[PDB]
Each structure stands twice: as C-alpha cells, then as structure tokens.
C-alpha cells in the first residue's frame, strides 16, 4: 500500500503533526462502501504521494480518533493541514469528486 495505517496511539504524531496534507479515510470493515473507497485512495496516494499523505483508521478498533472527530457515518474522510480538519467529506463521492475536492486545498 501507497496509503499508512494510522491508530489511536500514533494519530498525533502522523496526523495531527504533519508537514503536509493529509486525508485521513476513518473506515469500517461492515461498510460496504469503504470496499469502493478503498482503491480509489490507494490510486491517490500513489497518485498524489509527493502532495498528499493517505491514511486509514479503522474505527472497528480506533474508537478514540472517531469519537474525538465526531464521526458518525461511514465512510468520512478528513482532510487535515496543519494540526486541523479543514475539509469533511462523507459517504463514498468517487475517484473525479475527490481530486475536485483535493484540488484547491492541496
């Protein structure tokens, strides 16, 4: 995978303190569609790798970082600069809707 594996314990320091931009996909493995997300993101952070950094975080077993952002439908996905959330998107939009939506901010 082009896209890193983030946890309760290491959500800070991979997200919250990062460089650059990242999109952090909170996923569940009984959401059906996290399974159509799931390669799209893998193409962006591949894509995108030197702009963008893609994360994933299992709510099944990261409930701290969910409850901390207020997730509550799944797929969200969060895009974070600088320490803060600054974009929120919910429900799966597809490959072309999100790089619209990364486009401006990244």
Known sequence: S???KVTDASFATDVLSSNKPV???FWATWCG????VAPVLEEIA??????LTVAK???????E???NFQVVSIPTLILFK?????KRIVGAKGKAALL????DVV
């Open 65 to 67: 970082t969910a409850r």
């Open 2 to 4: 082009a896209t890193i």
């Open 57 to 63: 975080l299992d709510v099944d077993t990261n409930p």
């Open 100 to 103: 619209r939506e990364l486009s």
């Open 46 to 51: 591949t894509e995108r790798a030197t702009d």
């Open 33 to 36: 569609p996290s399974k159509m």
């Open 82 to 86: 600088d320490g803060q959330p600054v």
């Open 23 to 25: 999109l952090v996909d």
